[PDB]
Subunit: 345 residues, 3 copies
């Protein structure tokens, strides 16, 4: 007997986001989304390591859902008969029944329809959580995404000023636990079930083998770099359903950062590095001031450079020599420079 208008949303693969309004004058709606569970082998690194992944909608992360405060979110969760395990969904945005997990457990060949009222603003994790040890294993197998619940008036700076983004990207970070053989090579498996025992042993020691954005090392570099232009205000939503992260935009800042990810809280200003606690989503606005390549990392630089957790932005525009300039290009060290007379010698 919820007599509200219904609006179907077509989800898009991360790091892109389905079309939505920021500020709206539309009243509350039943926002209809479909998530289809896909268990499949995926490539996770640049050497071609494969992985028995479990996904919402075939991606790591699952897609970003966007609704407004006071909307109702009606999610059809589908578990195709080609899958081997039960699945469900827990929305950190939702109230009751373990986030909906206690209402969405489906076997292969089943679907279920959950509605939750979007009473809490912010970016939130959603993840599979079937029970017991299956909870971490489904989540670190890739079954996690995020949902953004925007204020109807859109974002503000917590000091009565509207904030509008020109562009939005969703960065889902995934810790992966890939078994190795005696020789230190990553092991391949024919099913998630066959990988489980060896994978739980790696999981137990809490140290990922891979930490990736958008499902694989290099996913958001080279050809798949994130585009932007000088002057654009870009919202960067970052989620980590299992493990902490410390995002940093190399050559940039977080102009406005909700590191705990909830828009009822004023953002922090001018951050270098922020913190996404495992089990949450956060968000950072930045207005690009300079063109060129930016690397977006977790600033555990070992994770960023050696375990997969670097994305790139390619920003078009004119260089601003006032903000930064190379005064003198690399040149031989004079004489007659008196390095040798310095304090620390």
């Amino acid at each position: 007997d919820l007599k509200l208008p219904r609006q179907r949303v077509d989800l898009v693969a991360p790091p892109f986001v389905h079309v939505h309004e920021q500020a709206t004058k539309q009243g509350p709606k039943i926002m209809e989304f479909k998530l289809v569970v896909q268990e499949k082998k995926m490539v996770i690194d640049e050497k071609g390591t494969t992985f028995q992944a479990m996904t919402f909608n075939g991606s790591m992360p699952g897609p970003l859902m966007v609704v407004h405060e006071g909307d109702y979110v009606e999610v059809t969760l589908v578990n195709p008969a080609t899958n081997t395990m039960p699945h469900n969904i827990d929305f950190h945005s939702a109230t009751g029944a373990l986030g909906g997990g206690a209402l969405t457990l489906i076997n292969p060949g089943e679907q279920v329809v959950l509605r939750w009222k979007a009473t809490r603003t912010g970016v939130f994790v959603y993840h599979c959580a079937p029970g017991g040890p299956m909870i971490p294993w489904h989540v670190v197998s890739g079954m996690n995404g995020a949902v953004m619940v925007l204020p109807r008036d859109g974002l503000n700076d917590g000091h009565g000023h509207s904030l509008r983004y020109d562009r939005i990207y969703y960065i889902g970070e995934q810790d992966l636990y890939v078994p190795r053989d005696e020789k230190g090579n990553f092991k391949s498996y024919d099913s998630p079930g066959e990988a489980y025992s060896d994978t739980e042993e790696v999981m137990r020691k809490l140290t990922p083998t891979h930490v990736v954005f958008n499902g694989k090392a290099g996913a958001l570099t080279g050809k798949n770099a994130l585009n932007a232009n000088v002057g654009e205000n870009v919202l960067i939503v970052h989620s980590q359903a299992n493990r902490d992260s410390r995002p940093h935009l190399i050559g940039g800042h977080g102009d406005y950062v909700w590191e705990t990810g909830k828009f009822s809280n004023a953002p922090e200003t001018g951050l270098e590095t922020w913190f996404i606690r495992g089990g949450s989503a956060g968000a950072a606005l930045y207005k690009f001031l300079q063109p060129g390549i930016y690397a977006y990392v977790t600033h555990n630089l070992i994770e960023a450079a050696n375990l997969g957790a670097t994305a790139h932005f390619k920003v078009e525009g004119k260089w601003n020599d006032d903000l930064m300039t190379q005064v003198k290009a690399p040149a031989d060290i004079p004489t007659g420079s008196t390095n040798e007379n310095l304090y620390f010698q």
Copy 2:
């Protein structure tokens, strides 16, 4: 020559809390507490693994002490002659002498009386800290608790509105470092001293074998679930004296969260997951809106499900279908559903 009234406090075992007022019109008092050190073997997991524990008042965590701003806290620390090691106490709430550690070192058969003025509001860790390597070892052996210093006016939302809790629970999280034999079995020892060398080796690699609430895996599940009712505002104090945590109430939120734990700072609103930095206590208020089981975890879900760090709430009340409802129970996937035509196939 402190001529204030004296009030003796009877401590209770966590996760319960001794009777106290929130707002008070009482003036500053000397609040008298007794903590008795108990070294003893304890069971820490559901397979019956034992552990040479060191405790305040026989529990992990030690009990929650509750006082008001400007009270004086007079702690009798007792180290019974049946114990084998010196102990002391460091109050993160206190000013001077390493939190009182430099004034409370006692051998077995000794007691000492420390007074500290409650000048700082919030929830704080207290822990043993005898010196050198004994500091981490006493703390990760279980010698840590918390103290709450309430404003005399009780809690507020940082925006001039009173916040009152119906119910308070203290969740002490403990990282444990249990040696394993060649075969991967947990080792048993006859004394804390005999366990030390092997335990320090595990401690050095920074990866707990167990992460538990109230001293053991399963301590706050099944029969020992935390009770609440729909409409109750519940304060959840969480401490971790050694290692970070990211609390999350599955199916709930943090309405008001002091993740750094200090009531001179406005809480954040509507959090999904918060962050307890090792060496601190934090606190979250939540008003239950839905009945049923809630799991309260660290949202490193590997820690939560596989290393012990899950508690349950059992909440009585009437389900609210407006906040969340199962629109359609699990059913076979139509035909004629066109899964196969979806974008990500």
Copy 3:
């Protein structure tokens, strides 16, 4: 064509800081700094373990640079011909070209001059970042420091009150990854290049062998303790370029803490323990109220006591028995004390 006055800054070795003003009436200047890369073997622990370090200005951390909002910072980066590797510098305070890394890559025998406008207030990390796996390896080899960009009006409490420090100390925390032989002994190498392969293997498992302040275990204890006096307001700048930390002043508090480190954000008040996300600098003011030894730690107490991460303050002044006093010195436990009748027995 930047026609501003030029001011040369003489850097000093951490934990000291070069002379500067807090509030200034000086207009924007070109602030000239020189950083000289020094690759050298350094001692990192109390057992004399050596390490193939890479440094700015021969120290871990590199020195603290201090400027004011709207200054321009003109950095001459020097890579002497006695070094073996290329180096560069990334300023988290700077906008564009990967923080300046994309404008400062120099071979041994070269120098380069970078200018960046100090548009963002706070404490920021600077670090070497040559590209790819060399980024973490240069950073965890010691090539990181910090820069403080003060408001021209100096610090404030975010509530319109000026905050002034009597004394400033820069604590650079360094995670180190030292290979071990079959026997568990730390390995020595003749060059950074020869250490690389074995070091990357340790780095990959994300668990430091050492966590140190000012480059070595014990660097800021005993003779090299940090001095202060009762009544002094001390600013403690803490940086970690690669890995999280949770600073705590044992026997003290953070009166005013910018844990994300950016002065456009009001500090938090009265913290026990704060959080420095890897890849950032934060800062805490404290007014000493009590004399004596204070230990300043990361409150992973295993790291603090067993991997090197403890500093000391030695504070001169008169003890305040009102804040804390030993009511009764250690004494035998009465009879007739009824320990045995207590709840937890």
